[PDB]
Design an enzyme around this catalytic site. Structure first.
Site, mmCIF file in Angstrom:
data_model
loop_
_atom_site.group_PDB
_atom_site.id
_atom_site.type_symbol
_atom_site.label_atom_id
_atom_site.label_comp_id
_atom_site.label_asym_id
_atom_site.label_seq_id
_atom_site.Cartn_x
_atom_site.Cartn_y
_atom_site.Cartn_z
ATOM 1 N N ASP A 375 0.828 -1.228 0.000
ATOM 2 C CA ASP A 375 0.000 0.000 0.000
ATOM 3 C C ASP A 375 0.865 1.283 0.000
ATOM 4 O O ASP A 375 0.554 2.258 -0.700
ATOM 5 C CB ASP A 375 -0.967 -0.009 1.203
ATOM 6 C CG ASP A 375 -2.137 -0.982 1.118
ATOM 7 O OD1 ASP A 375 -2.180 -1.791 0.155
ATOM 8 O OD2 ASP A 375 -3.010 -0.942 2.016
ATOM 9 N N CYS A 409 -0.889 1.922 -12.943
ATOM 10 C CA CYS A 409 -1.134 1.901 -11.502
ATOM 11 C C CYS A 409 -2.355 2.835 -11.279
ATOM 12 O O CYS A 409 -3.373 2.576 -11.935
ATOM 13 C CB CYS A 409 0.090 2.233 -10.635
ATOM 14 S SG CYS A 409 1.047 3.694 -11.145
ATOM 15 N N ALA A 411 -2.146 6.723 -10.863
ATOM 16 C CA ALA A 411 -1.778 7.940 -11.575
ATOM 17 C C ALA A 411 -1.088 7.600 -12.891
ATOM 18 O O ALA A 411 -1.226 8.346 -13.862
ATOM 19 C CB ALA A 411 -0.863 8.785 -10.708
#
Length: 475
Positions: A375, A409, A411
């Protein structure tokens, strides 16, 4: 005890080799050096019972031998094997115990290697200051106050006074008692593939990695290209972040869209060319149809998803693919999920993409969903990402006329850049092996000129080095 060629002495003679081993060495000490007997071949000089023997190492282009016995892909592997096994025979037995490390500059940060006096003066002015220095290949210890080039004769001295055993000692001793005053080095980012282990140790000691990344961050001012299409009212709802936009000159241009829609030609995606890639963001609910229009149009057959749809309670990508066995329509495009297979770090979904109204348009699109990336931060071991990247590479190679690999991903800059940059570098090593020069920040800058800010953090920056080093180790 692998990868590095520290015990390799590229410019010494047989007489110098015996002298080094008899004075500086001990029984069981050794060094490798080029063969005078045959260009490209090597010779291993070893100290045994007080005298030095010289062993012929065969280099066939395919492998390394001692003209018989085991074969090895690299010279460092041959050396490590004999250092750990002691089956080096003639019928006399030779023991490889202590490498005699080369004192000449090799993988050194301040050492720029093959670079002209004019090229060094061009480098010491454009990117250098007062006290700034670089060492080039005898050795020229070029300083700047105008650039003054202090010559050095090889024992090593700068014309007179003190004779230091190594240049690493003579660069630190001339900084305390200035001859010209030495303050900070210019530093190189280029590294030979075989020596990455040494450079990674340098960048880890107190900080190298921080320096390199911050320097690279300072060069983004030179990459302030147009993002006009990205910054428009009609495209404001198609971007995850108003500050992460595609460059106009590299962006993926969409055709034959909904005429009712104000702008139909837009997607937050750019082509990356080092095998090309499409660096794109995670799908927003409103951009799912666009993503598939782009996949179809660009003829991509491989998607690399490097994010979970939900990470740390936040929506990072919307589910743009149908469920196992199911089929869904995404505007003009139909997608069918044939099979879902799982491995430890990722899941592979075999999808069939086609235009609605034509079955004669159907192609297989393989989605490699990496599910184990943390994360926040980077993975502990680069192994998994490398095994994943190897799976994606074989799939792309195995398909005829396959378009660019779509990587994403949230962005489309952080993990996307990290994956693309690692893939580009290990591909240089795949085609040239351990004997090639790799420049991580030169490569990042090259990718950054195609999509803004690719590789967001220092964690990622170190991870590229960690993955490339681990790739070298397995060769």
């Amino acid at each position: 005890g692998m990868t590095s060629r520290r015990w390799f002495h590229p410019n010494i003679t047989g007489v110098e080799a015996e002298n080094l081993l008899l004075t500086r060495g001990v029984d069981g000490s050794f060094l490798a050096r080029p063969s005078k007997s045959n260009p490209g071949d090597f010779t291993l000089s070893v100290r045994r019972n007080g005298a030095v023997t010289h062993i012929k190492i065969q280099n066939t282009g395919d492998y390394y031998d001692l003209y018989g016995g085991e074969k090895f892909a690299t010279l460092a592997k041959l050396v490590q094997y004999y250092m750990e096994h002691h089956g080096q025979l003639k019928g006399d037995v030779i023991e490889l115990k202590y490498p005699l490390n080369c004192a000449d500059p090799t993988s050194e940060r301040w050492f720029h290697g093959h670079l002209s006096g004019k090229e060094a003066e061009k480098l010491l002015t454009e990117k250098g200051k007062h006290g700034s220095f670089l060492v080039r290949e005898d050795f020229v210890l070029s300083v700047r106050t105008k650039v003054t080039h202090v010559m050095i004769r090889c024992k090593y001295d700068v014309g007179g006074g003190e004779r230091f055993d190594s240049l690493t000692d003579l660069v630190e001793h001339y900084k305390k008692n200035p001859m010209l005053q030495l303050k900070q080095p210019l530093n190189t980012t280029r590294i030979n593939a075989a020596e990455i282990e040494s450079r990674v140790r340098e960048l880890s000691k107190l900080q190298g990695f921080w320096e390199e990344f911050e320097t690279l961050q300072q060069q983004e001012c030179k990459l302030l290209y147009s993002r006009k299409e990205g910054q428009r009212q009609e495209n404001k709802n198609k971007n995850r972040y108003k500050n992460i936009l595609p460059f106009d000159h590299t962006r993926v241009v969409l055709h034959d869209g909904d005429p009712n829609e104000p702008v139909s030609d837009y997607i937050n995606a750019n082509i990356i060319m080092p095998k090309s890639y499409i660096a794109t963001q995670g799908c927003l609910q409103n951009t799912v149809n666009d993503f598939w229009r782009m996949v179809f149009q660009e003829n991509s057959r491989v998607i690399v998803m490097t994010t979970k749809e939900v990470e740390r309670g936040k929506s990072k990508c919307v589910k743009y693919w149908p469920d196992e066995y199911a089929l869904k329509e995404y505007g003009v495009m139909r997608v069918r999920n044939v099979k879902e297979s799982a491995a430890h770090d990722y899941t592979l979904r075999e999808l069939k993409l086609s235009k609605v109204g034509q079955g004669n348009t159907e192609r297989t699109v393989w989605q490699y969903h990496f599910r184990t990336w943390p994360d926040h931060g980077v993975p502990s071991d680069p192994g998994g990402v490398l095994d994943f990247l190897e799976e994606v590479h074989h799939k792309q190679e195995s398909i005829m006329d396959a378009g660019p690999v779509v990587v994403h991903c949230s962005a489309g800059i952080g993990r996307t850049g990290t994956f693309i940059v690692i893939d580009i570098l290990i591909d240089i090593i795949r085609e040239k092996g351990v004997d090639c020069d790799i420049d991580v920040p030169k490569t990042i800058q090259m990718v950054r000129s195609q999509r803004s800010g690719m590789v967001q953090t220092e964690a990622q920056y170190r991870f590229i080095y960690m993955a490339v080093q681990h790739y070298i180790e397995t060769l």
